[PDB]
Amino acid sequence: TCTGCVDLDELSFEKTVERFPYSVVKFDIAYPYGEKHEAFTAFSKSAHKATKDLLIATVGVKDYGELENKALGDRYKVDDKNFPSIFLFKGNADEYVQLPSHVDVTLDNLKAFVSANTPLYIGRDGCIKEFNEVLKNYANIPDAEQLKLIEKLQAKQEQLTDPEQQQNARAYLIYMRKIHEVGYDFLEEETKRLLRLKAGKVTEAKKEELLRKLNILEVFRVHKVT
């Protein structure tokens, strides 16, 4: 299927959607693959890191054959012409919004579809929303402000529980410290390092970590330095 996606059928569908605050469900071919499904996969992974309240699910509809989930495609008025079709539910299989048929299925667009329609926000992997808010043009604030930002965020660092997020905050703190010490030259250096490392010998978990670092690194970019 896709990682962290829950594939639902006519018996599980409503009863599962009805247990979650929000659900985003991709109705598609029973054996989906291709750019759009990969984008929904990436979105499942990002969503799952970003929220506690959002079910990411798929329903595979088989037309001809001994039919699978055709009731569901019928209920939601989606068939071979519409796929993949993205629905967003809010606890009630009868109340939903459907991603406009003209919107490209990309991670970015799926993430905006959720934010446009729920209070949830799915940031970039590695980013910590709290940190971000206090970090814009960190690289242009005075050394003493920077030094202040470092002590506060280092406090939230140890108020955080999830390993992923604890690693993320440590990268933020490292970058604050480097950018405090080296100035903005740091960005390009760290970028080149992370990219050479990503384009080298490393695992599944390895390239994700490096991407999370890059996304965290991006927060510290400014349009002019001063």
Add this chain to the structure above:
Amino acid sequence: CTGCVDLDELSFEKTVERFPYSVVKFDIAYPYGEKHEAFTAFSKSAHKATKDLLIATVGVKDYGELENKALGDRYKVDDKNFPSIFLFKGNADEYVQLPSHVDVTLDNLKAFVSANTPLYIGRDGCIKEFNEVLKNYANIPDAEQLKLIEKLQAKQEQLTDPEQQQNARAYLIYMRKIHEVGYDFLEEETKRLLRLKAGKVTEAKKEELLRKLNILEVFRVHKVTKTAP
């Protein structure tokens, strides 16, 4: 399987913690076979009976990127004695594991459930909302029977699930016959169905007769207290 939700390292805890109870079968990825088919039958049965029970599977089948190996490890299960069946009580921390000696069958899974939760997976055919008001039906006065007939006929008309619609017909038949003839109907209809069931019947016809017998059983009374004809 149908109605089983397959969960993985990302979806497991978060899904299990949204349902009051979850029964989870850990097994190889792409499971198959007789225990899997029995878990499948159980999923169908539980879904017909409750809305509070998640039925789920985790495919460990560890030979690759090791999907779900961490999950199997959290619960200390093993290629070595798959399947392992767990019951969770609303989070991924509170669970009971089905003893590895218990054959994984439909009956044992239902028992596991009723043994460990307030949930009840009823007998095939039964409609809980009917059974709730039918206890001792055969002994109550005619006018109460008649009111129950009117009430369950009204319920039947609102039923939206097709298996319950069909089962409800058998309840109404039995209520009306029992009203009309008395408790002797229970022997009459039992002999009729047991005769059929003792014939050469397919598995699907067998199931259909069992559902009628499970419904008729609702009407049996421990002692007949109401006068005959």
